[PDB]
Amino acid sequence: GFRKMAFPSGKVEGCMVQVTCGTTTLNGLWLDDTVYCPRHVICTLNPNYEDLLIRKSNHSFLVQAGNVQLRVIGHSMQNCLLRLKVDTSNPKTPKYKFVRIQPGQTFSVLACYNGSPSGVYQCAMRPNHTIKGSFLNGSCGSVGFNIDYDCVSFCYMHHMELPTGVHAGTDLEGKFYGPFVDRQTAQAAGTDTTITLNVLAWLYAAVINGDRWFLNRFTTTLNDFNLVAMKYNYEPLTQDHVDILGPLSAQTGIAVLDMCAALKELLQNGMNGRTILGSTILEDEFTPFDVVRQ
Amino acid sequence: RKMAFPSGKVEGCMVQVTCGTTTLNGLWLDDTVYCPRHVICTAEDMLNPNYEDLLIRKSNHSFLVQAGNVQLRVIGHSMQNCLLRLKVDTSNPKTPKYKFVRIQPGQTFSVLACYNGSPSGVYQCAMRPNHTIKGSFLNGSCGSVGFNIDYDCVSFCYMHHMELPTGVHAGTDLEGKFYGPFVDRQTAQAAGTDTTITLNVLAWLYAAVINGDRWFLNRFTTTLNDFNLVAMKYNYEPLTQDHVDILGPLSAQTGIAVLDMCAALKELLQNGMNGRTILGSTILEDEFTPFDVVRQ
Numbered sequence: 076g077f078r079k080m081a082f083p084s085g086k087v088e089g090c091m092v093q094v095t096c097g098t099t100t101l102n103g104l105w106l107d108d109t110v111y112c113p114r115h116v117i118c119t120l121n122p123n124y125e126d127l128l129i130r131k132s133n134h135s136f137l138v139q140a141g142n143v144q145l146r147v148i149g150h151s152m153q154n155c156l157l158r159l160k161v162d163t164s165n166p167k168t169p170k171y172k173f174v175r176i177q178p179g180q181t182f183s184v185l186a187c188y189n190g191s192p193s194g195v196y197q198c199a200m201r202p203n204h205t206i207k208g209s210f211l212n213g214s215c216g217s218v219g220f221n222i223d224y225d226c227v228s229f230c231y232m233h234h235m236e237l238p239t240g241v242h243a244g245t246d247l248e249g250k251f252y253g254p255f256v257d258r259q260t261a262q263a264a265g266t267d268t269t270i271t272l273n274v275l276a277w278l279y280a281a282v283i284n285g286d287r288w289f290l291n292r293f294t295t296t297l298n299d300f301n302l303v304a305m306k307y308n309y310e311p312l313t314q315d316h317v318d319i320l321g322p323l324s325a326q327t328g329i330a331v332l333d334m335c336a337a338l339k340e341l342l343q344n345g346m347n348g349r350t351i352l353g354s355t356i357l358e359d360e361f362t363p364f365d366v367v368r369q
Numbered sequence: 370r371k372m373a374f375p376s377g378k379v380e381g382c383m384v385q386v387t388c389g390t391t392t393l394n395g396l397w398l399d400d401t402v403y404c405p406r407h408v409i410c411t412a413e414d415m416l417n418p419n420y421e422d423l424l425i426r427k428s429n430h431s432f433l434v435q436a437g438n439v440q441l442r443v444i445g446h447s448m449q450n451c452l453l454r455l456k457v458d459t460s461n462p463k464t465p466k467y468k469f470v471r472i473q474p475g476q477t478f479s480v481l482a483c484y485n486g487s488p489s490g491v492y493q494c495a496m497r498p499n500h501t502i503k504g505s506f507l508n509g510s511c512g513s514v515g516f517n518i519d520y521d522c523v524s525f526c527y528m529h530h531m532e533l534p535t536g537v538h539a540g541t542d543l544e545g546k547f548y549g550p551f552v553d554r555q556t557a558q559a560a561g562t563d564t565t566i567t568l569n570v571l572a573w574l575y576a577a578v579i580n581g582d583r584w585f586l587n588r589f590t591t592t593l594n595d596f597n598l599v600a601m602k603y604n605y606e607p608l609t610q611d612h613v614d615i616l617g618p619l620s621a622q623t624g625i626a627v628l629d630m631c632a633a634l635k636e637l638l639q640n641g642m643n644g645r646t647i648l649g650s651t652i653l654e655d656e657f658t659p660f661d662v663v664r665q
């Protein structure tokens with residue numbers, strides 16, 4: 076029973092607001108007396124965000140926190156975000172911090188529309204700095220997050236979809252993940268590589284679940300595995316990654332470099348139709364932490 | 370993708386209940402806490418416990434109920450099927466609009482997995498045709514709840530009790546009647562053979578058509594009875610005209626008649642999949658319902 080699970084969303088739900096500018100509406104995040112939303116809410120295509128921002132008043136921004144309307148007492152631009160100062164502090168803001176998530180790591184997304192939380196799901200920051208999210212028109216300002224004890228770590232705010240169907244956005248300081256810009260010009264994600272650390276954790280999960288048909292007695296070095304991995308657009312494995320896999324190595328008695336020799340043969344010979352935990356595809360959005368926790 | 374409902378309205382209802390050295394989670398709604406009755410058990414979890422006997426031997430004082438840091442006072446108690454109802458001195462201020470509902474096989478819900486009264490994860494899953502859940506539940510998760518939220522009202526449908534030897538899970542509704550043939554005793558128990566939820570696979574095939582995946586359609590069609598002959602051979606639930614009517618709205622938005630889709634699925638079952646993918650997966654997904662496909 077190994078499932079993609081999201082963090083409970085309640086602490087974040089109390090922070091979700093609707094921000095409207097003229098006719099374009101999206102979501103904002105209300106912490107203390109400040110509200111964060113994508114800056115492209117002030118748009119009507121090569122926009123000059125300094126020029127459009129100077130042309131706006133505090134009254135132009137309609138901020139609705141559920142029933143009640145909040146008044147912007149001031150505003151400023153932080154990279155690709157706006158920070159709206161509001162007259163009132165959210166009584167429900169939790170202990171929180173902003174963090175910059177790293178490729179391979181996961182977080183939960185609270186998909187919201189019109190300031191109302193709609194659904195919650197888990198995904199991963201891919202190596203090409205996009206995410207395979209679920210985002211419809213109106214979802215901008217939806218936030219991705221992790222929770223550790225009582226503290227919410229915010230790491231993502233949604234801005235855009237790319238032509239490949241995947242998604243791009245920023246941390247909570249407004250810096251984009253990846254080389255993307257918030258204008259609707261042609262933009263392309265880089266070639267997506269596979270999160271090798273996560274495929275390896277999934278193989279440990281499978282071995283723990285009772286299918287070990289893919290294990291072998293061949294051996295590999297870290298360097299000779301990385302050389303093969305990159306030919307197949309898998310991420311090279313670091314020695315920190317080997318260390319992170321230690322507990323699953325011990326629990327199963329399969330050395331990390333031996334699991335790499337298994338993976339190596341799967342890359343080179345494919346799966347002649349066989350399945351691992353039920354699919355002909357190696358899953359790369361389950362971390363070593365997820366396998367350990369289940 | 371599978372999405373869970375936002376868990377906030379449920380998270381405020383989660384508390385910790387301890388009897389002796391046994392701890393699990395409880396659901397606190399107004400002035401009463403609901404929780405699995407085997408919280409009053411110790412070593413003889415496995416021994417056929419007499420729960421009427423174990424309960425007559427207890428006082429309100431033996432139930433330690435904590436809502437975070439604050440301890441609530443048990444004013445009374447009673448058993449309802451496999452649940453305990455604890456009357457608490459204080460009424461939960463965070464109590465949402467809610468009802469108790471008994472879900473049917475094939476229907477989906479969200480699980481808030483809890484430990485020591487503290488929410489820790491949320492996910493979507495389906496009630497299996499054999500009345501088990503394919504959940505993710507560890508020691509201490511009992512009393513975790515399943516629910517749907519449409520729209521301001523929480524529909525509680527599941528409370529967790531136990532894990533079968535096969536790793537699937539079993540529990541009750543919130544009036545404490547088990548789903549399936551199970552009893553709350555640490556004896557080894559088998560579910561009936563599980564099946565694939567045909568109504569859900571068909572709903573998902575409509576979902577695939579909408580987001581671009583059309584490779585699997587074909588010019589053929591079939592009748593209800595021709596299709597069920599192939600489904601029974603592959604361990605799929607039979608399809609009925611109610612199912613077809615349920616799929617009606619999904620026929621319109623697609624322009625694909627329900628029994629054309631059955632022909633497409635029949636080919637996918639008889640032909641397998643080329644190793645290619647449908648909406649991302651290499652297996653026929655049966656835990657998204659028609660009602661899920663419309664919402665998302």
Ligand SMILES: *[C@H](O)[C@H](C[C@@H]1CCNC1=O)NC(=O)[C@H](CC(C)C)NC(=O)OCc1ccccc1
Nearest residue numbers: 115210211212213214215234235236257258259
């Ligand atoms: C913000 O609500 C929205 C999120 C997009 C909406 C479609 N799916 C999403 O994730 N962002 C935009 O609409 C974005 C605006 C730029 C100024 C950042 N435009 C965009 O992503 O173009 C791609 C696209 C637009 C509409 C439908 C599908 C793809």
Ligand SMILES: *[C@H](O)[C@H](C[C@@H]1CCNC1=O)NC(=O)[C@H](CC(C)C)NC(=O)OCc1ccccc1
Nearest residue numbers: 506507508509510511531532534554556557558
């Ligand atoms: C309550 O926290 C716990 C959750 C179970 C155990 C770990 N994973 C879970 O889903 N439930 C029990 O421990 C339960 C208590 C009985 C008195 C109902 N016992 C149990 O699940 O034993 C495992 C088992 C049950 C039935 C057949 C075979 C094994």
